[PDB]
Design a protein around this ligand. Structure first.
Ligand code: HEM
Length: 148
């Protein structure tokens, strides 16, 4: 695993300011799949527009949480067996919140977007494919929360 090094290396750029970078991730997500917006219901209110989410302390705390789970998957990039149980649970919580499993493919595209934009010239097709591999394994794990 040298592609493990490619993940470890790229992530370090992004980990320096996780809320900045997570903000790009979720802005892109809403641009591709606007129907995700109502699933963030804090105090029983719905955001009207994507920009409304960026003022919400609870939504910004969710971005921090997301970046923490990714950082965990990176730390255990060599063996993802050790997060499997936690990820099944995380999946079930999201099934319960109303997230469809198909929407996690959008998430993966939004992560690769955010990496591409952050790393520019450094984001080689080798690293695109490493991250695709990792994320596909990560979603495989989460997928059990929808049974399977
Ligand atoms: C695809 C769209 C997503 C939506 C709509 C969504 C929505 C939510 C909502 C509504 C909650 C409960 C409220 C909260 O704690 O803020 C939640 C919790 C959480 N989400 Fe997400 N989420 C998504 C993706 C992700 C992803 C990709 C990750 C991680 C990589 C993640 C990590 C978390 C964590 C760690 C929690 C707290 C779970 C717990 O321990 O109870 N979420 N999400």
């Amino acid at each position: 695993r040298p592609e493990s090094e490619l993940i470890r290396q790229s992530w370090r750029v992004v980990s320096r300011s996780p809320l900045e970078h997570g903000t790009v991730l979720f802005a892109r997500l809403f641009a591709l799949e606007p129907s995700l917006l109502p699933l963030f219901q804090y105090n029983g209110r719905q955001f009207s527009s994507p920009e409304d989410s960026l003022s919400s302390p609870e939504f910004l705390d969710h971005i921090r949480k997301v970046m923490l789970v990714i950082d965990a998957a990176v730390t255990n990039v060599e063996d993802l067996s050790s997060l499997e149980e936690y990820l099944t649970s995380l999946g079930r919580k999201h099934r319960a919140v109303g997230v469809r499993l198909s929407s996690f493919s959008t998430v993966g595209e939004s992560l690769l977007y955010m990496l591409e934009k952050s790393l520019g010239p450094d984001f080689t097709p080798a690293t695109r494919t490493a991250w695709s591999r990792l994320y596909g394994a990560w979603v495989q794990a989460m997928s059990r929360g929808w049974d399977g």
